[PDB]
Amino acid sequence: IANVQCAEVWCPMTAEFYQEYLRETARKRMLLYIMNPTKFQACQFLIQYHERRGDKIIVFSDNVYALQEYALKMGKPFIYGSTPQQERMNILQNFQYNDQINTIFLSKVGDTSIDLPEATCLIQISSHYGSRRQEAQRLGRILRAKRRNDEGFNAFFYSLVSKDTQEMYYSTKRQAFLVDQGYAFKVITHLHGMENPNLAYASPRERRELLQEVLAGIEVDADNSVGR
């Protein structure tokens, strides 16, 4: 069946983002480790790497502010709570059947339930308190073998983690849980050859633009999307 490589990708906090992360005490600070430009660049690189392989990729964001900043910047479709049934089905049908559209962004509305589509790669932008078990379930529902029976791994799960933030605490936990569940698991601190790609936020000024936008957000913007 699907043979899944699980990885955490540890990304340093940009010093400007780390500065504010410390100073801010309300849940607003979650947005600084979520939008950290090193983490965005890692996500962007992984989408490029996998799209070159014609893999299908779902990127999960539990936070709507982040869902849009990522998807719109990377020019990928996104689905969340207010997305109409018609537009949602357009996007899912595109993901499933149109070879030009192989990456989509989905929020907490994905699990569960509408029918999560199948993919070969699942990237989680964030990690939080506290459901290790909902993560493995979603991984299981989404990931299908890329049709590479010879290969060691034919599907891929990545969880992006910001260093020096509360995100890391969730890591020793996730690693233990996933391996105990029978998964191959590793920690990636440096993505081989990100410097051969043209990724966003190469300049301090572009990072500062995003930083201003994050600082303008409120504690409400840093809550997970809730849905019943």
Added chain:
DNA sequence: CCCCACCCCCTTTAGTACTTATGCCTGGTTATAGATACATTGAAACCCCTTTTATAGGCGCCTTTTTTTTTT
């Protein structure tokens, strides 16, 4: 170091008011089928042509004659 108090959260479900689509029925004029106005080519139906020899009324129409009225 231990106990008590305060702060922040997610749980999902029940209310009636408000908006959108479907069925409702309703006022023009347009598209159909056949007959009417009628007009078509077709045909049949119609009177018309050749005269005679006698009888004797009525018929209408002609130019010349006589009488009456008008004007000078």
